[PDB]
Subunit: 233 residues, 3 copies
């Protein structure tokens, strides 16, 4: 009942540091992607970590460099570390809800991003056909983390786009586009390492289940009890 108190405090302070460290991975991730810097992004990942993009997984430093570098950086900046003249890709990061597992060796986190993106008139000659010149996009992250040798790293980065808009017309006017199945790397040089089982896009919606327990009611939370209090109108 002094050793017990110290050990219990040490655990509590470790969890507070764990939360800060995991939130920092996401906030840093954002500052690196805004500048199309895939190297810093890949270094955030456990070597067996993955990024989920278009219903596949891009695995390890190779997969992360392929997605953010071979695909995105070539597409957006012509294969230059950013930022560069006339290219905006700000993915503002916010609203972290992080859950450390009981053993303190893994964690989950919900986050979200809002992207303001575009090719300025000065560089729109370099914009790929079929991309809007300036756009908004938002999505939800439900990510996994691992603590390796005392350091938190990204184990799974799963960004689920919720909506997109052309700046000029807004989210209400976006045309649905049917998403074909990806071909994997290596046959597809920018493809995923592997496919997920069985997402079509805005205006279609699908819940992203919360990784976090109800913060007041926890496992006792029952929807139906509360639904009884609502009426038709």
């Amino acid at each position: 009942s002094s050793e017990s108190r110290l050990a219990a405090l040490e655990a509590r302070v470790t969890e507070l540091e764990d939360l800060n460290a995991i939130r920092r991975l996401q906030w840093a991730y954002g500052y690196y992607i805004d500048y199309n810097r895939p190297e810093e992004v890949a270094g955030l990942f456990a070597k067996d970590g993955a990024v989920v993009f278009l219903s596949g997984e891009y695995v390890g430093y190779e997969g992360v460099m392929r997605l953010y570098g071979t695909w995105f950086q070539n597409l957006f900046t012509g294969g230059r570390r950013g930022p560069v003249h006339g290219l905006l890709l700000d993915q503002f990061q916010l609203q972290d809800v992080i859950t450390i597992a009981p053993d303190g060796q893994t964690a989950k986190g919900r986050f979200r991003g809002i992207l303001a993106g575009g090719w300025h008139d000065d560089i729109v000659k370099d914009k790929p056909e079929g991309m809007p010149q300036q756009f908004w996009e938002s999505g939800i992250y439900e990510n996994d983390y691992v603590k390796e040798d005392g350091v938190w790293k990204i184990k799974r980065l799963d960004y689920m786009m919720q909506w997109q808009a052309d700046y000029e017309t807004g989210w209400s006017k976006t045309i649905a586009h049917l998403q074909p199945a990806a071909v994997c790397f290596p046959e597809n040089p920018i493809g995923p390492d592997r496919l997920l089982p069985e997402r079509q896009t805005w205006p279609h919606r699908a819940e992203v289940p919360m990784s976090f327990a109800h913060p007041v009611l926890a496992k006792a939370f029952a929807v139906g009890e509360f639904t009884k209090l609502q009426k038709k109108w």
Copy 2:
């Protein structure tokens, strides 16, 4: 050593308390974006209240009536969301939380920015007089209680600051007293005093800060600094 331990334990409790109160607001946001009124109501103390457009919605009943009977019916036709073509993302940010000296209540300032709308696929279901797609921002100055060791929302006070049709923007935007529940099926339980009534954008009104000046505290006096400012 007992004095030192107890003082450390208190400091760690306050750090946990700040995280727990911020979590209520961030979770609140993820639930409201999905028109999930049950999860929202469960965040509240049983004697909690929501202040919306100068009325109070009291307890689980008031909270279910505001977010369920009114908003969920309005936006999704009375379905837990998210649903096809309906956007109601209220991004939550910029927490400044003050735990009371006794550690049993707290205040927090927060803010939200809402991207909202009916996609062309579902605008047939949009009520008349609502814009198809809009931005809105507002400020929260909330109250919290720690009940049986658990932080809960005591008073959620959201004050809308501006709204814009997506197409025209906030500069180009163009309000009766509420009728209470139950005569108004979606009304508040009670009205705020006229003195606390807010008119909307372009009309503005300060939302006083719940937090002390973070550097000067009680010593902060505006007039001392105003002396240094000139006309231009």
Copy 3:
């Protein structure tokens, strides 16, 4: 560590808790800063600063209470509200604050922090008669902060507030349509009543969106730290 003394363990916990409180206090200065500037309240802003602190605006420094009152009061408050503490009818200047990455120095007495803002700004049609010529009626703007902090007598204060605008847009036309405007060097106060106390070197002059320039990260790589080397990862990237 079951082999460490209880004293060493206590002291090490006390240091750890102090660092966690330091991070919260520094983030609070930026979040509070934002709520004060959104209301055009220069006095509360000035009080956040060390007395020898500065704000970097357009390649100059505004130094101490005087400089901070001059930038936010004499210049900005006069420009936006006609010299009234806000908020006021029809005037929007919301600079949403987010995405803190804060690094406390080893000695615990200084700190750096990266942050960013996104501004939704404008004059409502009701007050646009009072808008200065050459300013858009409604606009977006975003910028990056790389700030310095000092802990004075156990209180964290802003030592250097360095806001670097990254982009701006007229609401109607968007960031892709913004016209580059060549930015002349500032004239200092006092010859310029709203000017900086001193200029930064030409080498620190920034031209504006669509021109871009990195704002180096104040933080180490959060996983690899000083071991992070770009070239090792660049080897894994191919042409496409």
